[PDB]
Design a protein around this ligand. Structure first.
Ligand SMILES: O=C(Nc1ccc(C(=O)NCc2c(C(=O)O)[nH]c3ccccc23)cc1)NC1CC1
Length: 167
């Protein structure tokens, strides 16, 4: 038993809810919140901009130190950093950005990072300003992630479409 509320169950291990991941994170304090990061951990907009804003820019400060030490992530890769006031940990995962021409096949590799964590609150990778089809992203999520994932979908219209077209 865990503290996530109001989710619709899609499969044995995947759940979904129309929710703001920031507000969801502040209420649940999950062990892991997933950030839709880029390789530079520059959290300017979308989910990342919103998560970083909610941390009063502490996420960005920590991220800049991480990059200065380690260099950029790979597309499809991830790193674990602090969750600040939102979660114990933040798993920064880089899905491909279609608006940069990145290979959509790397989306499966991106979701594989979730399997290193028993439970996660997360957005749909490569959705929103990353330019992928969220229905495709949901399909890859369900077919790749084996751990328990609680997907927060900000847009109500998109949430209803995801539920209604889901196979
Ligand atoms: O500003 C906010 N929240 C807040 C702001 C923006 C977002 C957001 O861009 N979402 C779309 C998105 C999804 C998805 O929804 O599937 N996946 C993505 C992957 C990469 C980039 C974007 C997305 C989400 C939340 N809260 C303030 C009031 C306290």
């Amino acid at each position: 038993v865990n503290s996530f509320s109001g989710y619709l169950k899609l499969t044995d291990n995947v759940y979904i809810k129309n929710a703001d991941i920031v507000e969801e994170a502040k209420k649940v304090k999950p062990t892991v919140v997933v950030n839709a990061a880029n390789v530079y951990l520059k959290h300017g907009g979308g989910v990342a901009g919103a998560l970083n804003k909610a941390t009063n820019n502490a996420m960005q400060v920590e991220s800049d130190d991480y990059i200065a030490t380690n260099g950029p992530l790979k597309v499809g890769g991830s790193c674990v950093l602090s969750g600040h006031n939102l979660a114990k940990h933040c798993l920064h995962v880089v899905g491909p950005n279609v608006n940069k021409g990145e290979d959509i096949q790397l989306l499966k590799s991106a979701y594989e990072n979730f399997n290193q964590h028993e439970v996660l609150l997360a957005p749909l990778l490569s959705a929103g300003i990353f330019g992928a089809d969220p229905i495709h992203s949901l399909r890859v999520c369900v077919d790749t992630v084996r751990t328990n994932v609680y997907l927060a979908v900000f847009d109500k219209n998109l949430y209803d479409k995801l539920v209604s077209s889901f196979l």
